[PDB]
Design an enzyme around this catalytic site. Structure first.
Site, PDB file in Angstrom:
ATOM      1  N   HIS A 196       0.808  -1.223   0.000  1.00 56.53           N
ATOM      2  CA  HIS A 196       0.000   0.000   0.000  1.00 56.53           C
ATOM      3  C   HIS A 196       0.847   1.281   0.000  1.00 56.53           C
ATOM      4  O   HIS A 196       0.310   2.385  -0.112  1.00 56.53           O
ATOM      5  CB  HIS A 196      -1.065  -0.016   1.115  1.00 56.53           C
ATOM      6  CG  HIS A 196      -0.557   0.374   2.469  1.00 56.53           C
ATOM      7  ND1 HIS A 196      -0.192  -0.552   3.422  1.00 56.53           N
ATOM      8  CD2 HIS A 196      -0.395   1.589   3.044  1.00 56.53           C
ATOM      9  CE1 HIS A 196       0.195   0.076   4.518  1.00 56.53           C
ATOM     10  NE2 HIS A 196       0.080   1.377   4.315  1.00 56.53           N
TER      11      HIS A 196
ATOM     12  N   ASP B  26      -0.026  -7.665   1.930  1.00 57.36           N
ATOM     13  CA  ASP B  26       0.444  -6.282   1.942  1.00 57.36           C
ATOM     14  C   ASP B  26       1.966  -6.234   2.084  1.00 57.36           C
ATOM     15  O   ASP B  26       2.511  -5.944   3.154  1.00 57.36           O
ATOM     16  CB  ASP B  26      -0.257  -5.480   3.042  1.00 57.36           C
ATOM     17  CG  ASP B  26      -0.040  -3.982   2.907  1.00 57.36           C
ATOM     18  OD1 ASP B  26       0.348  -3.516   1.812  1.00 57.36           O
ATOM     19  OD2 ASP B  26      -0.268  -3.266   3.902  1.00 57.36           O
TER      20      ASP B  26
ATOM     21  N   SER C 156       3.526   3.579   7.936  1.00 60.73           N
ATOM     22  CA  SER C 156       3.303   2.477   7.000  1.00 60.73           C
ATOM     23  C   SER C 156       4.592   1.991   6.350  1.00 60.73           C
ATOM     24  O   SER C 156       5.432   2.794   5.943  1.00 60.73           O
ATOM     25  CB  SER C 156       2.332   2.911   5.906  1.00 60.73           C
ATOM     26  OG  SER C 156       1.017   3.038   6.407  1.00 60.73           O
ATOM     27  N   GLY C 157       4.738   0.672   6.266  1.00 62.36           N
ATOM     28  CA  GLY C 157       5.857   0.059   5.557  1.00 62.36           C
ATOM     29  C   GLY C 157       7.097  -0.216   6.388  1.00 62.36           C
ATOM     30  O   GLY C 157       8.000  -0.922   5.935  1.00 62.36           O
TER      31      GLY C 157
END
Ligand SMILES: [Ca+2]
Ligand SMILES: [Ca+2]
Length: 234
Positions: free
Chosen positions: A41, A86, A180-181
């Site tokens: 994402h 993801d 995120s990530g």
């Protein structure tokens, strides 16, 4: 990251920043001299990666910028399902050299045990409601929780998704917008990728949901070896 403190300059050597003209939007983890692992994402257009960054304002004299030469997502990933597989693997356009600011973190040899202490880090919001981006990354320690906790908190979370559940059961420490990530590091081992959570950040019974890296080891290794048609586990 909420409920933490500034990371020490030596504390986040495998942390990668994803940026465009607007600024930082995601993190990733350096797993080899020319490969970065992040969340699917986090995919974007017109972006670059910064390695060896601590402060956004004061440059490290040896911090590196790289381009995404190749991007790999699971061939059997369902679009429209953000929580399905993801994970994204990126090849850098040139290798990075090791330094006190840049070193790869290896893939895990075994999955983590429930109750283990895990390390989270990122340039995401340090306030739970308002968006407050720090100049340096923030760091916190949380617990690996039973999957049932995340099941109880998120009605949309299918058991089919290969995830880890981490945070504080009662809340208070959590990843937040912009994290995120990034990596979840449990007992010094790279175990998770920041994938999903709730806002306001750090609510009780709403822990962080992380992509379970261990399950994707064979897929990652196959791509690095040269097998670009490699499939992810169902
Ligand atoms: Ca230095
Ligand atoms: Ca294996």
């Amino acid at each position: 990251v909420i409920g933490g403190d500034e990371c020490n300059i030596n504390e986040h050597r495998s942390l990668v920043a994803f940026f465009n003209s607007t600024g930082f939007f995601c993190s990733g983890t350096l797993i080899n001299e020319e490969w970065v692992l992040t969340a699917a994402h986090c995919d974007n257009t017109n972006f670059q990666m910064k390695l060896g960054v601590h402060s956004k304002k004061v440059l490290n004299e040896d911090e590196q910028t790289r381009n995404p030469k190749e991007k790999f997502i699971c061939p059997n990933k369902k679009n429209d399902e953000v929580l399905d597989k993801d994970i994204m693997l990126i090849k850098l356009d040139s290798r990075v050299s090791n330094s006190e600011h840049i070193v790869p973190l290896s893939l895990p040899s075994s999955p983590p045990s429930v109750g283990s202490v895990c390390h989270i880090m990122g340039w995401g919001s340090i306030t739970p409601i308002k968006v407050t981006y720090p100049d340096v990354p923030y760091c916190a320690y949380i617990n690996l929780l039973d999957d049932a906790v995340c099941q109880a908190g998120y009605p949309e979370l299918l058991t089919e998704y290969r995830t880890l559940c981490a945070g504080i059961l009662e809340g208070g420490k959590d990843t937040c917008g912009g994290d995120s990530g990034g990596p979840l590091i449990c007992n010094g081992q790279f175990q998770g990728i920041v994938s999903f959570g709730a806002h306001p950040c750090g609510q009780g019974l709403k822990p962080g949901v992380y992509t379970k890296v261990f399950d994707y080891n064979h897929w990652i290794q196959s791509i690095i070896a040269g097998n670009t048609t490699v499939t992810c586990p169902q």
